[PDB]
Design a protein around this nucleic acid. Structure first.
Lengths: 52, 68, 150, 121, 191
RNA sequence: CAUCAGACACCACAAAAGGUGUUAGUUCAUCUAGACAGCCGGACGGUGGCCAUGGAAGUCGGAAUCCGCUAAGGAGUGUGU
């Protein structure tokens, strides 16, 4: 019991991120290029997967 | 007690800024910026000092603190 | 005297009213039989705007234009057995879908009778509404009787 | 048909200016589709409500300096979430219908224009 | 393309006075004083009047123009911080173990002590930076409030308090415990 | 601007594929006929449309994919139940 008004905030900080494909790096949920240089600033992104 | 933003009083290029030519055939004479072409070239003529109207670089000339 | 307003729904003859009408001082089983006197023509799925005032169930019937177009259609079914869709396409009613749809409280903000007669005459997706044509492409040709209802 | 729709807007604004003489600019902000629908149904007799792009109205009045230049006194008042009411009733009845009806807890009239002049009404 | 001049206009309210000598920027007003060293950015300030200061970059590239606009935002942030302030309402998020937070003074540093996070036995301690104060709100359960003048101090101490409670070797999206920044507002209660 | 810079034949190496790094360009469209972005508000009615009826109203599912008001609102983008 985390009272989901709070759990939406924790999911803003932990769940609503996108993830780069090549370098697995956590990203802002509306980004278009991964910020890292080791993946080459690629534009291949996916959502971080929700629970169940 | 006010805003103490200081100056940085540059001397600006403008139409009619008078300039001192140092390198070339004119070699230390006065002329005036007629119309500035672009970021680095100006257009000058110093007709009393004898130097003809010419496009010239801003490396070959130095801005003087006088204007008209 | 108090004010209670509910929206009863599609039922065959006497077809969960108790959960919506317990706090309005009315019945549950007698209120299910109280809506049978209105939706009994009218054997098509519609709504009923019930207005109960603190001591009795007084259900009224809301005028529905899609149910009025379904009242100008084929009624044949009884209950729970038509085995495919329980649907039926039927007769045209080229002028009967222009008087009844323009008399169902003049909905959709119509400024003409060809407006409501196309809004509730071209939304037919269960009936054909024509003898040699179809619906939803007769709105640009329905230009008759506009001055009569207005 | 954006060129077509905008030319249609020019044409209908030229139409509704040169057919009506009583203008009511209304300060209608954040008004719902339920309030406006009962404005569309109520005003079927005398008034014509016209919302839309007030900065498309800017060029619409810019091009209409030649014909009836007395509409030059409107573009300082087209600022704010305003709309047009086109009728021939001069002051009273339209201002009594717009402001008083359909209020809950913005429908006012901010400008009244009759044949060239402006009136507080 | 080498933009010939770009400029921004910093609005200055009544109660603050600024003081820019070459790029040291002092801003003094009704809550305190803020100073920011901007020697690394090469922009040109010009007072047009007491309420408006135009910053400008002459003959700059692209990154140089980006530096200009962020100079404007930095000066505006100091100005709104010394007029209004900043106030970050962080709120505790715990699953089963009630996170206990105190302030301790040790060697005059005023650490924020985080106890019993996830049922750990490790006592965490965060140094409170200079310029930020920490309160615990009335009649809203499990909240901490960090209010100060600088954006950088308040925000960086909020991030220190958040990220000292990262959950290790677990599924982070199941174990959501931590102290998370909820509201980012101003000290002045009218706004 | 390179938290593996690059540097002039033969000659002592580098590719496909990517980059909202940054400069230049091509085509088309919106473009001033005040757009884009953002903030404030609507996001209608026919309609719980036809239905499979414990329940389906945009939303476990299927097909038609309409009209009026419009300045604009989908027989609805997800959630909820």
């Amino acid at each position: 019991i985390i009272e989901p008004s709070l759990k939406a905030l924790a999911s803003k900080y932990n769940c609503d991120k996108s993830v780069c494909r090549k370098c697995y790096a956590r990203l802002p949920p509306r980004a278009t290029n991964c910020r890292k240089r080791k993946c080459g600033h690629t534009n291949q992104l996916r959502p971080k997967k929700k629970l169940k | 007690t006010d805003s103490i933003v200081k100056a940085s009083n540059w001397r600006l290029v403008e139409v009619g800024r008078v300039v001192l030519i140092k390198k070339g055939q004119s070699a230390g004479k006065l002329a005036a910026i007629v119309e500035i072409i672009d970021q680095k070239k100006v257009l000058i003529d110093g007709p009393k000092a004898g130097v003809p109207r010419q496009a010239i670089n801003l490396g070959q000339v130095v801005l003087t603190p006088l204007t008209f | 005297e108090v004010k209670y307003l509910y929206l009863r729904a599609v039922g065959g003859e006497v077809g969960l009213a108790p959960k919506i009408g317990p706090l309005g001082l009315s019945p549950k089983k007698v209120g299910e039989d109280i809506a049978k006197a209105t939706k009994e023509k009218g054997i098509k799925v519609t709504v009923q705007l019930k207005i109960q005032n603190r001591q009795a169930a007084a259900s009224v019937v809301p005028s529905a234009s899609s149910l009025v177009i379904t009242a100008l259609k084929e009624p044949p079914r009884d209950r729970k057995k038509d085995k495919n869709v329980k649907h039926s396409g039927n007769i045209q009613l080229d002028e009967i879908i222009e008087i009844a749809r323009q008399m169902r409280d003049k909905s959709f903000g119509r400024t003409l009778a060809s407006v409501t007669k196309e809004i509730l005459g071209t939304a037919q997706s269960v009936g054909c509404r024509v003898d040699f044509k179809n619906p939803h492409d007769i709105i640009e040709g329905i230009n008759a009787g506009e001055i009569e209802i207005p | 048909g954006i060129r077509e729709k905008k030319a249609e807007y020019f044409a209908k604004l030229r139409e509704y200016l040169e057919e009506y003489k009583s203008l009511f600019v209304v300060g209608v902000d954040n008004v719902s589709s339920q309030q406006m629908h009962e404005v569309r149904k109520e005003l079927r007799g005398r008034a014509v409500v016209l919302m839309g792009k007030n900065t498309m109205v800017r060029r619409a009045i810019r091009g209409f300096l030649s014909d009836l230049p007395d509409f030059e006194k409107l573009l300082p008042f087209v600022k704010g979430n305003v709309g047009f009411v086109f009728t021939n009733e001069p002051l009273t009845e339209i201002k009594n219908v717009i402001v008083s009806n359909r209020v809950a807890a913005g429908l006012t009239v901010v400008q009244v224009y009759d044949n060239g002049q402006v009136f507080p009404s | 393309m080498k933009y010939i001049q770009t400029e921004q206009q910093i609005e200055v309210p009544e109660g603050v006075t600024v003081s820019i000598k070459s790029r040291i920027v002092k801003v003094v007003g009704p809550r305190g004083t803020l100073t920011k060293n901007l020697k690394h950015i090469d922009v040109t300030f010009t007072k047009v009047n007491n309420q408006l200061i135009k910053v400008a970059v002459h003959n700059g590239g692209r990154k140089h123009v980006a530096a200009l606009r962020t100079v404007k935002s930095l000066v505006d942030n100091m100005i709104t911080g010394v007029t209004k302030g900043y106030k970050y309402k962080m709120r505790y998020v715990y699953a089963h173990f009630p996170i206990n937070v105190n302030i301790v003074e040790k060697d005059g540093a005023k650490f924020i002590e985080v106890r019993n996070f996830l049922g750990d036995k490790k006592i965490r301690n965060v140094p409170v930076r200079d310029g930020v104060t920490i309160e615990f709100s009335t009649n809203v359960k499990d909240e901490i409030v960090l209010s100060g003048n600088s954006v950088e101090d308040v925000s960086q101490n909020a991030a220190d308090l958040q990220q000292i409670c990262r959950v290790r070797n677990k599924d982070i999206r199941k174990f959501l415990d931590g102290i998370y920044v909820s509201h980012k507002g101003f000290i002045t209660e009218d706004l």
